[PDB]
Design a protein around this ligand. Structure first.
Ligand SMILES: [Mg+2]
Length: 120
């Protein structure tokens, strides 16, 4: 089974996304902010990170920056999943090492297809 680290400050969002990921046979590890994410990332290297932008303590842009500065982290694929739209958010996220940027409210089928693109 592939392992996905799901990083979002919304418990409701994490519930929905984890449910959809598990249906595909993936195993999910959760983090409610960027700091928690990096703490868990010190322990293991997931096959994929799904990453929110707007979070307390440490936001998604900061996470992306920190992933790039470590040899162990810089190759992990990241799909940014965020309520925020606009070219600037997309450009910044990609410039900091995100693979894909997707918008909330999330379309489960489109999301899962992209996850599949990167994993299988
Ligand atoms: Mg958020």
């Amino acid at each position: 089974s592939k392992k996905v680290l799901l990083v979002d400050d919304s418990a409701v969002l994490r519930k929905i996304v984890s449910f959809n990921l598990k249906k595909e046979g993936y195993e999910v590890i959760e983090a409610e902010n960027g700091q928690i994410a990096l703490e868990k990332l010190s322990e293991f290297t997931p096959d994929l990170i799904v990453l929110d932008i707007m979070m307390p303590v440490m936001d998604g842009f900061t996470v992306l920056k920190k992933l790039q500065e470590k040899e162990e982290w810089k190759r992990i694929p990241v799909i940014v999943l965020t309520a925020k739209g606009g070219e600037e958010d997309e450009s910044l996220a990609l410039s900091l090492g995100a693979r894909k940027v997707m918008r909330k409210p999330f379309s489960p089928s489109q999301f899962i297809e992209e996850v599949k693109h990167l994993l299988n």
